[PDB]
Amino acid sequence: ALRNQIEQFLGAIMQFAENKHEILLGECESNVKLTSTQEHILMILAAEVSTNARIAEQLKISPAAVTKALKKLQEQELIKSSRATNDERVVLWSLTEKAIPVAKEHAAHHEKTLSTYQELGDKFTDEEQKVISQFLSVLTEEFR
Amino acid sequence: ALRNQIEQFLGAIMQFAENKHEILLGECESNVKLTSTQEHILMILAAEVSTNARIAEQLKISPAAVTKALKKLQEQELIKSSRATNDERVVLWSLTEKAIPVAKEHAAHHEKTLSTYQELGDKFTDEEQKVISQFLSVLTEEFR
Ligand SMILES: [Zn+2]
Ligand SMILES: [Zn+2]
Ligand SMILES: [Zn+2]
Ligand SMILES: [Zn+2]
């Protein structure tokens, strides 16, 4: 029965992420029209001023998709270009004042998702959460 | 830490299905060059002779993607067209003798995937599998 439940559970995630890149539980409270990745790019740029290369490394997406998402992001006056004193085809990205609340929302939407996972876990005792933790460790390794 | 582990586990599935539609664990033993969905279409057609509409319902994919996959499937002499005595734009699909071992492989790769899930579950006792089952029930409902 557990074999069929694991197949069912993984199947539900498949349907849920047929067009999404990341899993975010709840609804997006952003007033601006931006995709999952686009809003996340603003989130990582808020904490640290990142280059075109680091965005691809953090998001785990292709640099071709990065330039495609960054061009639509700078179009809506959300991100601004910057270049170092020792240029080695280096393009640093900075966050504008227009993007600051959007990045704040996504960071809150990520902690909102984790808090819902925390609740589901808190239904079980410390010794029960260990059994779940051990399972999710073995299962996650099949997808690595 | 469980909230972070759930976020990590779901993330590993995200990376796994970035180009996949269904989760199959193990390498594909098929000698013919066909995609995940293409080899799954042959599997469902082997047991029951399905119409162009039921394929979209079973696979949970758009009928536009169905015709795109069915045209490449009939090209390699794997599937054959059929029409009823009372035609109401009905296009029934039948499996050829060339496709029979391919559908058999896929069905065995799905049982190979379930058997690996069975193993991971069998590591835990009957009372421990209940704790996991209760968790996966509550978690799967967030993606429904
Ligand atoms: Zn995000
Ligand atoms: Zn958001
Ligand atoms: Zn399949
Ligand atoms: Zn196969």
Author numbering:
A (entry chain A), B (entry chain B): 2 to 145
Text taken from the publication that reported this structure:
In this study, we have characterized ZitRMG, a metallo-regulator of the MarR superfamily. In L. lactis subspecies cremoris strain MG1363, we have showed that ZitR repressor controls an emergency response to Zn(II) starvation, allowing Zn(II) uptake under extreme conditions, while impeding it in a wide concentration range, from repletion to toxicity. In solution, ZitRMG has been shown to be a stable dimer able to bind, as expected, both Zn(II) and double-stranded DNA fragments bearing the palindromic TTAACYRGTTAA recognition sequence. ZitRMG protein is folded as a triangular-shaped homo-dimer with a two-fold pseudo-symmetric axis, a typical topology for a MarR superfamily member.
The structure of ZitRMG holo-form was first determined at low resolution by single anomalous wavelength dispersion (SAD) and then, after crystal improvement by molecular replacement, at 2.8 Å resolution. The asymmetric unit (ASU) contained 8 ZitRMG molecules, and 16 Zn(II) atoms. ZitRMG molecules formed four dimers (AB, CD, EF and GH), all binding four Zn(II) atoms in total (two per protomer). In AB, both protomers have almost the same conformation and superimpose to each other with all 1144 atoms-RMSD of 0.34 Å. In ZitRMG dimerization interface, the N-terminal α1 helix (protomer A), which is stacking between α5'-α6' helices, interacts with α1’, its counterpart in protomer B, and the same holds true for the C-terminal α6 and α6' helices. In ZitRMG like in E. coli MarR, streptococcal AdcR proteins and ZitRIL, the DNA-binding domain is folded as a wHTH domain made of a helix region (formed by α2, α3 and α4 helices) and a β strand region (β1 and β2 strands). Zn(II) is clearly coordinated by Oε1-Glu23ZitR, Nδ1-His41ZitR, Nε2-His107ZitR and Nε2-His111ZitR, although a supplementary coordination involving a second atom of the first ligand (Oε2) has also been proposed in AdcRSpne (see below). Interestingly, ZitRMG is shown here to better align to the DNA-bound form of any MarR protein than to its DNA-free counterpart, suggesting that holo-ZitRMG dimer could be folded in a DNA-binding prone conformation.
